Amino acid sequence: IRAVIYARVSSSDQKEDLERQINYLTNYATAKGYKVVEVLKDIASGLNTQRKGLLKLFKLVEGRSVDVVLITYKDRLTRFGFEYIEELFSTMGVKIEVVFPKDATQELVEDLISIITSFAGKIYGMRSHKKTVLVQGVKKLIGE
Amino acid sequence: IRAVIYARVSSSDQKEDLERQINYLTNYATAKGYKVVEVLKDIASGLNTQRKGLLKLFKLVEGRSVDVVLITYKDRLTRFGFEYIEELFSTMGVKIEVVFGEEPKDATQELVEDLISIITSFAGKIYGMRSHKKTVLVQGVKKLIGE
């Protein structure tokens, strides 16, 4: 069962934790009996739909080369719209195997802000005073 | 040539604005000369990936019946992950035609409603789906929005 490993970390500092993720899935697959075709990684947010590695994964899947995609948690593949990726892959007959995070809270808070900042711009103005009010307030509120 | 109309409104009260949507696109199409194969609608949030209409649209496109999808704004198809839907459709050789751009004007009420749900879900993920600190952040953000 030809497999493609997708691993992702948000920050550059977390570079060591990404290699551990690849390694978990690499040994996971070779114990399961999967031949690891390729290993695709990214040091970016789950929110970015234009990740270089993710778009290489899309092309790999579409090329009907691989049979299964391995990720540690759903969170790794994408923050939002997993179901759409699941649908794109399934039409190519590719299954997503989710091996399991209670760990990441800093990733959830950081992703929350970036959403609030973009939406605040859409609601009040990308260079408005009220946008700054909400984002400075929310940042202070999480501190508590 | 063969076209499918996708229209969406978040609330039941906005039922009049959904029919206006369908109409803009139905005529747009007859002017484009496109034959409108089907019209799919939904009274739900862009955040819901499991909309009955969206999933009927997915099956229609996958069946290679339709050639183009018409929407007024990207926003209508989905709040997040438009690029994934765009990719799913393109592999079936279906194009998404977005009639409008940076035109949203009333959209501020849908953006704030979606923003509250996002903060509520994330608060659960950060503090606990039934936690005290989750209630603290969501009650605070709601109060901060008023101002």
Author numbering:
A (entry chain B): 65 to 164, 168 to 211
B (entry chain A): 65 to 211
What did the article's authors report about this structure?
Although there is considerable structural similarity between the catalytic core domains of the subunits, the quaternary structures of the TnpA and smSRs dimers are radically different.
Although the overall configurations of the TnpAIS1535 and TnpAISC1926 dimers are similar, there are significant differences in the details of the dimer interfaces within the core. The E helices are interrupted by a four residue β-turn (GRRG in TnpAIS1535 and GMRS in TnpAISC1926) and fold into an antiparallel structure. Thus, the two DBDs can readily fit into adjacent major groove segments on the same helical face even with the short three residue linker that is present in TnpAISC1926. The best diffracting crystals of TnpAISC1926 CTD were obtained using the hanging drop method by mixing equal volumes of a 10 mg/ml protein solution in 20 mM MOPS, pH 7.0, 100 mM Na-acetate, 0.1 mM DTT with a reservoir solution containing 8% (v/v) tacsimate, pH 4.0, and 20% (w/v) PEG3350.
